[PDB]
Design a binder for these strands. Structure first.
Ligand SMILES: O=C(O)CCC(=O)C(=O)O
Ligand SMILES: [Mn+2]
Length: 200
DNA sequence: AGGTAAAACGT
DNA sequence: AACGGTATTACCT
């Protein structure tokens, strides 16, 4: 449990023991709602490929960003949140000092070599974010409330969990372009799980 | 009024 | 290649 910011902590290798099962469940989720690279409102295809599980999934469309109960690619509900995901999330939230967190949304990100996520805030209720890294390492940027607030850069390795909330809830953060490499469990990619409470 | 796109090129 | 401009507006509710 390392002090990233007010309300924020990195729990290194927290999910290491759970990771094989987590990855099996990512595969099961994506067999129903496939990974897709979404298109921004501005018309650019994101380098990260995404899917979701739980009641609500994050998606883009022409008018903005949206949490939706329906996957617009399949026209069916997102797959149910795996119990492995929910149990890990709750354990990590508890360890980070957010014992009452009840997520209803899990965004699954797959990073191939070169994929990034430019600095952004998680907007759209005042609950924490629990963010689980799997596979290849990546450099995570964590800033402040303003885009030009100085950035901490942290290598996130397989099994690391970052939790933010309270004063750091809306802080800008991001992922630098993924370096190529090998990981025994994911082979050639990084996955992240982002748990939120997106609904009432 | 106030929130949201940019979760996306030049130096 | 780290930093910051752009939304310094347009278009919604
Ligand atoms: O991949 C990560 O560690 C961060 C992902 C993220 O910020 C998001 O999906 O909103
Ligand atoms: Mn985010």
């Amino acid at each position: 449990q390392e002090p990233l910011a007010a309300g924020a902590v990195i729990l290194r290798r927290f999910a290491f023991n759970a990771a094989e099962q987590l990855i099996r469940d990512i595969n099961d989720v994506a067999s129903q709602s496939p990974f897709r690279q979404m298109v921004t409102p501005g018309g650019y295809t994101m380098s990260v490929a995404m899917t979701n599980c739980g009641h609500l999934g994050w998606t883009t469309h022409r008018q903005g960003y949206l949490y939706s109960p329906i996957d617009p690619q399949t026209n069916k509900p997102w797959p149910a949140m795996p119990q492995s995901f929910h149990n890990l999330c709750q354990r990590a939230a508890t360890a980070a000092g957010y014992p009452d967190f009840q997520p209803d949304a899990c965004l699954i990100n797959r990073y191939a070599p070169g994929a990034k996520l430019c600095l952004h805030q998680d907007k759209i209720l005042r609950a924490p974010i629990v963010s689980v890294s799997l596979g290849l390492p990546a450099i995570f940027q964590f800033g402040g409330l303003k885009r030009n607030d100085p950035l901490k850069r942290l290598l996130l390795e397989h099994g690391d969990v970052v939790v933010w909330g309270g004063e750091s809830r809306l802080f800008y953060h991001g992922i630098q372009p993924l370096k190529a490499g090998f990981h025994p469990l994911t082979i050639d990619c990084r996955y992240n799980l982002t748990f939120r409470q997106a609904g009432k």
